[PDB]
Amino acid sequence: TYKYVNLREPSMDMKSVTDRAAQTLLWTELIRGLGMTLSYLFREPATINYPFEKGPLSPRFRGEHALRRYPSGEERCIACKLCEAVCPAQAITIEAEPRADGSRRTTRYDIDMTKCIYCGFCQEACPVDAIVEGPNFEFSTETHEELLYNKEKLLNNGDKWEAEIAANIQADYLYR
Amino acid sequence: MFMINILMLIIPILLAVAFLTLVERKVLGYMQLRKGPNVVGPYGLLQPIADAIKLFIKEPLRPATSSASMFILAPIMALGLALTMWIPLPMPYPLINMNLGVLFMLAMSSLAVYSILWSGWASNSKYALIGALRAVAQTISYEVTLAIILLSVLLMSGSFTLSTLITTQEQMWLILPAWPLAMMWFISTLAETNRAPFDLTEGESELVSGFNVEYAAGPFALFFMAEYANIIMMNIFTAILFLGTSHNPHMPELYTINFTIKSLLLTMSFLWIRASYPRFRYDQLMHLLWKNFLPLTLALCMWHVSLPILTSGIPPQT
Amino acid sequence: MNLMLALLTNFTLATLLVIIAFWLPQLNVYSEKTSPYECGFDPMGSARLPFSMKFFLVAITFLLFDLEIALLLPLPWASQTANLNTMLTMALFLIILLAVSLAYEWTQKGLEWTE
Amino acid sequence: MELLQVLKRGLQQVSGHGGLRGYLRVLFRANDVRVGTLVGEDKYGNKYYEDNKQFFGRHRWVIYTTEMNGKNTFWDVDGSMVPPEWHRWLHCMTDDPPTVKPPTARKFIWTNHKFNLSGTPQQYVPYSTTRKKIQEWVPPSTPYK
Amino acid sequence: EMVRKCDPHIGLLHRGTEKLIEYKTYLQALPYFDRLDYVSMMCNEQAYSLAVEKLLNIRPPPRAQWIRVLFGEITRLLNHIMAVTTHALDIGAMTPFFWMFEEREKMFEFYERVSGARMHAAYVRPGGVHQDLPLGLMDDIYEFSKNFSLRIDELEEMLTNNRIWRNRTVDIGIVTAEDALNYGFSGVMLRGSGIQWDLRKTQPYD
Amino acid sequence: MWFEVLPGIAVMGVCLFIPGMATARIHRFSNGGKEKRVAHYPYQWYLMERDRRVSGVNRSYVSKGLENID
Amino acid sequence: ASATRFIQWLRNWASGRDLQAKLQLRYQEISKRTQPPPKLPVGPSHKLSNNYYCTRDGRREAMPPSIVMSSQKKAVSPAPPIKRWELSQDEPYL
Amino acid sequence: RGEYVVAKLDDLINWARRSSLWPMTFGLACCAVEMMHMAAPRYDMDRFGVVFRASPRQSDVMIVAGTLTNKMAPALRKVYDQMPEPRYVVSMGSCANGGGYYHYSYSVVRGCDRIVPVDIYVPGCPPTAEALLYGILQLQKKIKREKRLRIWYRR
Numbered sequence A: 001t002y003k004y005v006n007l008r009e010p011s012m013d014m015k016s017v018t019d020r021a022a023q024t025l026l027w028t029e030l031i032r033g034l035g036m037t038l039s040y041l042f043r044e045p046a047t048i049n050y051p052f053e054k055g056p057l058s059p060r061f062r063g064e065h066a067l068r069r070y071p072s073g074e075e076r077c078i079a080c081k082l083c084e085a086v087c088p089a090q091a092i093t094i095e096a097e098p099r100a101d102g103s104r105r106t107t108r109y110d111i112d113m114t115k116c117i118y119c120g121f122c123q124e125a126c127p128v129d130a131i132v133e134g135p136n137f138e139f140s141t142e143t144h145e146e147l148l149y150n151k152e153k154l155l156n157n158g159d160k161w162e163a164e165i166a167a168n169i170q171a172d173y174l175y176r
Numbered sequence B: 001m002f003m004i005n006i007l008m009l010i011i012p013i014l015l016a017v018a019f020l021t022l023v024e025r026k027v028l029g030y031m032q033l034r035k036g037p038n039v040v041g042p043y044g045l046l047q048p049i050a051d052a053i054k055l056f057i058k059e060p061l062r063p064a065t066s067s068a069s070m071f072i073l074a075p076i077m078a079l080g081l082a083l084t085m086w087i088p089l090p091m092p093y094p095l096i097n098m099n100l101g102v103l104f105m106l107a108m109s110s111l112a113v114y115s116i117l118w119s120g121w122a123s124n125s126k127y128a129l130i131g132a133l134r135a136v137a138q139t140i141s142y143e144v145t146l147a148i149i150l151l152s153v154l155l156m157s158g159s160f161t162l163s164t165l166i167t168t169q170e171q172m173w174l175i176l177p178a179w180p181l182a183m184m185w186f187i188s189t190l191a192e193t194n195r196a197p198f199d200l201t202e203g204e205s206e207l208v209s210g211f212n213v214e215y216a217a218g219p220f221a222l223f224f225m226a227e228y229a230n231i232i233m234m235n236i237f238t239a240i241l242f243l244g245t246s247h248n249p250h251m252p253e254l255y256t257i258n259f260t261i262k263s264l265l266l267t268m269s270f271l272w273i274r275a276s277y278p279r280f281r282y283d284q285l286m287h288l289l290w291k292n293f294l295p296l297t298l299a300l301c302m303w304h305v306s307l308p309i310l311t312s313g314i315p316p317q318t
Numbered sequence C: 001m002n003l004m005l006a007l008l009t010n011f012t013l014a015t016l017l018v019i020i021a022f023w024l025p026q027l028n029v030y031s032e033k034t035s036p037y038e039c040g041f042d043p044m045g046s047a048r049l050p051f052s053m054k055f056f057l058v059a060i061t062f063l064l065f066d067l068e069i070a071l072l073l074p075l076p077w078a079s080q081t082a083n084l085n086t087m088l089t090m091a092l093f094l095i096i097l098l099a100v101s102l103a104y105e106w107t108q109k110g111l112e113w114t115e
Numbered sequence D: 001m002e003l004l005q006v007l008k009r010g011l012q013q014v015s016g017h018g019g020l021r022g023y024l025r026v027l028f029r030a031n032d033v034r035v036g037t038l039v040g041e042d043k044y045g046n047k048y049y050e051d052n053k054q055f056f057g058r059h060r061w062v063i064y065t066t067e068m069n070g071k072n073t074f075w076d077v078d079g080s081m082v083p084p085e086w087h088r089w090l091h092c093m094t095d096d097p098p099t100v101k102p103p104t105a106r107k108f109i110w111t112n113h114k115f116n117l118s119g120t121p122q123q124y125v126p127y128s129t130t131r132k133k134i135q136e137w138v139p140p141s142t143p144y145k
Numbered sequence E: 001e002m003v004r005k006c007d008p009h010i011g012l013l014h015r016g017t018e019k020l021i022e023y024k025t026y027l028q029a030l031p032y033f034d035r036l037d038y039v040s041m042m043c044n045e046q047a048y049s050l051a052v053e054k055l056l057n058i059r060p061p062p063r064a065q066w067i068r069v070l071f072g073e074i075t076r077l078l079n080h081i082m083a084v085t086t087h088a089l090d091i092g093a094m095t096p097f098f099w100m101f102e103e104r105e106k107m108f109e110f111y112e113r114v115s116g117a118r119m120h121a122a123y124v125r126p127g128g129v130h131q132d133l134p135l136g137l138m139d140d141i142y143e144f145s146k147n148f149s150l151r152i153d154e155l156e157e158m159l160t161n162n163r164i165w166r167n168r169t170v171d172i173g174i175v176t177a178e179d180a181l182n183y184g185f186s187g188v189m190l191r192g193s194g195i196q197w198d199l200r201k202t203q204p205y206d
Numbered sequence F: 001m002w003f004e005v006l007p008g009i010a011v012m013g014v015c016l017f018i019p020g021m022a023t024a025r026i027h028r029f030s031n032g033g034k035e036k037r038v039a040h041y042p043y044q045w046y047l048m049e050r051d052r053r054v055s056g057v058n059r060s061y062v063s064k065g066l067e068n069i070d
Numbered sequence G: 001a002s003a004t005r006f007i008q009w010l011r012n013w014a015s016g017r018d019l020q021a022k023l024q025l026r027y028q029e030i031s032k033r034t035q036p037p038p039k040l041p042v043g044p045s046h047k048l049s050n051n052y053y054c055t056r057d058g059r060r061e062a063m064p065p066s067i068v069m070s071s072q073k074k075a076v077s078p079a080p081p082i083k084r085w086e087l088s089q090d091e092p093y094l
Numbered sequence H: 001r002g003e004y005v006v007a008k009l010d011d012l013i014n015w016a017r018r019s020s021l022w023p024m025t026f027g028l029a030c031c032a033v034e035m036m037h038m039a040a041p042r043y044d045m046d047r048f049g050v051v052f053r054a055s056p057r058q059s060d061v062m063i064v065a066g067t068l069t070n071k072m073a074p075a076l077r078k079v080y081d082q083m084p085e086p087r088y089v090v091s092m093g094s095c096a097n098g099g100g101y102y103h104y105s106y107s108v109v110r111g112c113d114r115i116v117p118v119d120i121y122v123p124g125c126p127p128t129a130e131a132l133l134y135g136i137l138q139l140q141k142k143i144k145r146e147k148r149l150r151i152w153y154r155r
């Protein structure tokens, strides 16, 4: 089915013709448009009072990255490199070796946050919930070098944000 | 004591202009479902001060290809002439009482156009030139109709003196016997002030910034102050012409309050109109005035010559 | 005097604002900064090249019409004449000939811009 | 009259903030003089408010502390001062404030939140976390040749 | 100001997307389609997903197909708000942009709630969608959809019968039905000239 | 809310009220408490110039009444 | 929602609509930001028997293209002519 | 005291410049859509004194909102040079920050800071409208820290 957006014939009875003459001379349809903007003047504005108020977000929000731990404090990451393999941007760089206790752990874990596209594939790929995108989006920096995260930065992010990250994962892990 | 009176005219003009910029941004904002400046000072009251200081400590640029003297002259003319427009205004007493105040205002409005033409030409850049030549077309569009609209109204006042319009409208606003002319006058002032939907010589979405695209910092501010001063002055002129305030010689401040309220609301209407409509095409502006207003203005001019004579109500010469 | 004093004060105030604007701020002038603006790419051809005027005929008509209002602006004074029969006839005569000239230019397509 | 009731609410805001001095402090710090229900306060002094009659997005807000981590934040406030436990509630990722549903405690979680440290001596500086890969031969310290 | 010739020079945003895709797996290449027409993110994902599902010879499940249509039409609303309001903003009518971008902001919330991203969701994938709708989302889409037609009415009150708007758009850029087909036009650029064509009707998907 | 636009309007209104009030009051101060004399036509200027001589203090606005005719 | 009665009347009149029935600002009709956990269904291949992958393997049913002609009676069209669209009965003319 | 005066004068000019930041109407790709959402009613950047102006001569900030390609690089540098000073550059999004998804392309500049100096880097792809607003407020607090007159006094 289709419809015509603009295929109508104006009527030619004297009343309709005068109605259009009054429209042309008295600007009635322009006055009508002024009414709409006037109504908006007296509507409450939609503006929120940032930074004292914040736009709403959901548990799935993809923000700044963080490396997580088990409740014992051991790192979850076991250097499988799945996140590195899937990263569409090649933003992840990893090196690994047996730890002094034999554990399979990384010695390098970098995320170039200026390469990253904040797609969340890395956290989908991680089999142990080690790498996540946290809820923080307020981490703009004054220098480029400050956005080249190494393992120490990412672990500090996890320790900094774990309280929120764990609750966000609790809310959404049953959709995953 | 006259020098003091001059300063008590132009210092307030510039302060009113600065806070008209804040008012416009708030009025547009709320009409756009937002707030507008409300952080710099309470309710944004210091925002005009911040912008003014910002611009005058910004680096001013003289373009490599520009004609230096004319580049500097044009903004000086713009603001100088804008302030000159205010001296014959009766609020209720003019600073300068002129026999032909209306004719003086017409002449000074024509001279102010050259601050657009010369700034655009002196910039020696294509967008600036295009903006200036749009000002030529705009002036050609409205100037003839604007003068004849005034003439038809003055056939009821009887003189070219601005203060006589107060006497003329002591019983009734001239908006009643001449609302068709008020309609056409009001539109002509939007074109005269380069205001939306006739903001063509700047035409941001088309010409980036048009005639003033090469201007920065203080020289640019002069053009902004000029335009906003003319917007207020032309609505005071509209209030005097068509919404005459009664004048009590012993309480002249009652006139000033009533007249100031009327002029403010007319200025708010300019912002309201900017919020509501799309922009004209500058050839469509020329056809609006010449093919619609001018035939009607000529007819109404004939009518307002005959009407006083046929009703035996010709006004006094004095 | 009052008039000349008022004009001098206005244009002196404007001049002082320009003097402050140029001498107060810190400047850093180099070639690229002062180059002509054209949306990021260098201009092609001088801005002094001829710019065709498509409303040239309306512009000439404006000159003739702009002199008509000089002839009409005295009408408020002319209405004080005792010889109102002649004055009203000549006032209407002048305005009609202005309307006839407008109608001629309109019907002859003088008000359409050259394409 | 309603126009009178409106003026009464405006004056209640001056008392609701503890007087003209308190009313002016919030007007100049936050450009907002609304009064809300105190949902809670965090260990840095940030106070959290709600008013569910306000529209979604304006129904929760924080008045930042005036001093955090040795920094004077009376005029300098930024969104990175909200700690993670309140971050979830303030952004409406959850309905429950940390007062009612406190986060799970871990011994490795930061006890002291830190705001954005860019531009300061505490800023992060990147470096390679791996040890040198090739070991160079060190010549003997004795002469013998 | 007569236009004697238009010579559009493009490539100022050419980023070798098509060469880059040759170095990605099919999953890794999906987010590149969010960033093509970056106002219609999920519609671009869907086109790529249908292509891969066709070469795979697999079919997405019915619920994913319904979610794809649902968010395809939410995306169409996103696109048309941007198309109309920025078009009006260029012609000088700046106020519809602000009224309608508040609606766009609320639709960005739907994107973020299903995917975690307001714009580049990477949500539609070959095989279906990445995650199921969070509980309570369809209620909120209904609340938004309930009020939206009134917002379109306000937009039409500002423009549709405005004489200034009509003067700027009526008989401007007329293209004939024959030229549009031969020049490779599609979508509204065909239907504006009377051609009765819409792939959702003639070559339906999902 | 829209009434938060009012403060800027009031400031604009006060500034625009000043020139009219100032001109009116400076005229009274400079013309012995009265309105400034308006002389659009030569006759009005003639009388004003005559008042300057009649005043005896070279001010056209110092009036002389019956007390000046013996 | 907090507008006074006169202001509601004024903006209702100016716009010609009843704006209070469809406010563009969200209040309490929106969902709670905390929800009960989901329990999502499984797919048709979640079975313990009669579920051999080789009977549900779409990729292995894809075939190389059929060669119709290579270089190693009535006229036809690619498909039947398209049926003419019918006018909408919801609202044929805008 | 000279120091007290220049300290207060620094506060005035710093306050005026950060309170009245006019970005150039300059956008490149997807990130410009979030920049549009900062001007939209929810965030209303105008309420901080942040107003877009088309002309570089009347702009104080360049927000590089999107991928910078090699073909575009000379134009971006041109309009940056044509901004009067003081001027600031905000790098928005991974593309502008360092190439992002197109870092390895033959046609993309690996970070706009190869072309212009950058004051603030806003991460994300795209950064949310609120994240960009956080970056602008960060720029304001940087301007507030400037010590031009204090350093001039001690020259």
Ligand SMILES: CCCCCCCCCCCCCCCCCC(=O)OC[C@H](COP(=O)([O-])OCC[N+](C)(C)C)OC(=O)CCCCCCCCCCCCCCCCC
Pocket (backbone or CB within 6 Å): B052, B053, B056, B057, C017, C019, C020, C023, C024, C025, C026, H009, H012, H013, H148, H149, H151, H152, H155
């Ligand atoms: C409606 C009109 C509105 C007008 C608004 C007027 C602005 C009011 C606020 C004024 C604040 C004080 C001015 C400071 C801004 C100066 C610009 C700047 O940042 O320079 C940084 C420069 C920094 O210089 P620097 O030495 O540190 O380094 C620059 C050199 N390189 C590039 C190598 C590093 O400061 C100065 O050079 C001098 C500062 C002096 C401050 C006192 C100003 C005295 C004013 C007299 C100037 C002489 C000309 C006469 C002008 C008319 C006098 C009023």
Ligand SMILES: CCCCCCCCCCCCCCCCCC(=O)OC[C@H](COP(=O)(O)OCCN)OC(=O)CCCCCCCCCCCCCCCCC
Pocket (backbone or CB within 6 Å): A024, A025, A026, A027, A030, A031, B180, B182, B183, B184, B186, B187, B197, B238, B242, B273, B277, B288, B292, B293, B296, B303, E163
């Ligand atoms: C006793 C005998 C009496 C004899 C005398 C009788 C005289 C009265 C009867 C004569 C008719 C009265 C009306 C005359 C007013 C002028 C009318 C007019 O000129 O409008 C026509 C004009 C063109 O419209 P358009 O459709 O584009 O083209 C027509 C076809 N060619 O349309 C336009 O102008 C469009 C303008 C667009 C820009 C508008 C932007 C502002 C709109 C809001 C302004 C509201 C008006 C407020 C006025 C305030 C006054 C202080």
Ligand SMILES: CCCCCCCCCCCCO[C@@H]1O[C@H](CO)[C@@H](O[C@H]2O[C@H](CO)[C@@H](O)[C@H](O)[C@H]2O)[C@H](O)[C@H]1O
Pocket (backbone or CB within 6 Å): B309, C084, C085, C086, C088, C089, C092, C093, C096, C097
């Ligand atoms: C292209 C060419 C167009 C030419 C058009 C010319 C149109 C002229 C129309 C006639 C205009 C004047 O019309 C004429 O005016 C005079 C006075 O003004 C009127 O005269 C009337 O008033 C005057 C005084 O005011 C009395 O002296 C007279 O007794 C009385 O009849 C005439 O009754 C009227 O017929």
Ligand SMILES: CCCCCCCCCCCCO[C@@H]1O[C@H](CO)[C@@H](O[C@H]2O[C@H](CO)[C@@H](O)[C@H](O)[C@H]2O)[C@H](O)[C@H]1O
Pocket (backbone or CB within 6 Å): B291, B295, B296, B298, B299, B302, C095, C096, C099, C100, C102, C103, C106, C107, C108, C109
């Ligand atoms: C005494 C003063 C008052 C009397 C009016 C005086 C002005 C008269 C104006 C011209 C009247 C006749 O001349 C004019 O001819 C042209 C023919 O090209 C017509 O113009 C025609 O094309 C133009 C442009 O599309 C449009 O105005 C209109 O669509 C159409 O009518 C005008 O409708 C007609 O008005």
Ligand code: SF4
Pocket (backbone or CB within 6 Å): A083, A086, A087, A088, A089, A090, A091, A092, A111, A115, A116, A117, A118, A119, A120, A121, A122, A123, A133
């Ligand atoms: S979010 Fe995407 S681009 Fe960023 S590190 Fe993870 S997989 Fe790579």
Ligand code: SF4
Pocket (backbone or CB within 6 Å): A076, A077, A078, A079, A080, A081, A082, A083, A084, A094, A122, A125, A126, A127, A128, A129, A130, A131
């Ligand atoms: S996918 Fe997880 S466990 Fe594997 S390397 Fe990445 S962060 Fe470590």
Ligand code: SF4
Pocket (backbone or CB within 6 Å): E035, E038, H029, H030, H031, H032, H065, H066, H067, H092, H093, H094, H095, H096, H100, H101, H124, H125, H126, H127
């Ligand atoms: S950083 Fe991301 S959102 Fe921004 S332009 Fe690049 S791909 Fe688009």
